[PDB]
Amino acid sequence: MNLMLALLTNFTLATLLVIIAFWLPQLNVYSEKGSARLPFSMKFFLVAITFLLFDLEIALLLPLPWASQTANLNTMLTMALFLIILLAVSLAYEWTQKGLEWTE
Template sequence: MPLMLTSAIIIMMINTTLVILLNITSKKTIMDREKSSPFECGFDPKSSARLPFSMHFFLIAIIFLIFDVEITLLFPIIISMKLNNLTNYLIVFTAFIIILLIGLFHEWKQGALTWTN
């Protein structure tokens, strides 16, 4: 146990030293106006480099990512069907699908899934 504690302390000290060293050496010290401005073939840009951001598209993308991650959580449940009995499998699977459907209906009622406003 003491060996494990000392090795953990040594690893934490090495990590802390590396983080501090990298933060010191990686900072940009010279801020040049030309380097921080947007680059357009060597000329000054004609318009703003920032494009308008669609918040609705961002929400749809986040909802997609959430449901995509939850689909990946379903794969181990399907594989564990061989190891568990059918009643436990159905209870867990049904509860998971109900939680997904509640989230989907909530987003639908909030209007996050309708594209046109």
Template sequence: MLYCSFMIMIISTVVMMISSALSKKTITDREKNSPFECGFDPKGSARWPFSLRFFLIAVIFLIFDVEITLLLPLVITMLMANIYSWTFIGLFFLLILLLGLYHEWSQGALDWTN
């Protein structure tokens, strides 16, 4: 059993080393190393930093977008459910959404002036 495990480790290590040695590209081409912009030379550097505030707003938008899609079945089940439980669940979910929005607002995540 130990001999078989040892042989498997040796064989897999040798195969990984051979594949790593064979996959090395020695020819570097300027066109292959440059970013692709519809076949034209790039106007500027492709490594510019992006706005972290924009990224945060995009993530918040995605979170609230997913939560809105969770609200859609609530409208469909309105006629099939008890009106009191339906109202309580809907208001509770909206309250959670509004508390999350208030928290993001109070933390300054939605303030673009800073």
């Protein structure tokens, strides 16, 4: 219940500050004074997609602090290094294929 209250307070206050920031006295009485390819490089797509794939790999590494408590440490250490090495191979592939370049 506490976490819900904290979240509700944080965003309710944020909402109140935003609305009052928009509606304050102004003291004036007169009249006040689409879905296409945005010209944006394919390189920026590849960054976001590259981030996603690395983020999915990170999801698999997150259990590592708990996995190190296993008695099957031989298997666990081999699989941890395998996953990270494969992540490094992914980076090496993008790097050597000019996927990390910003020219052209």
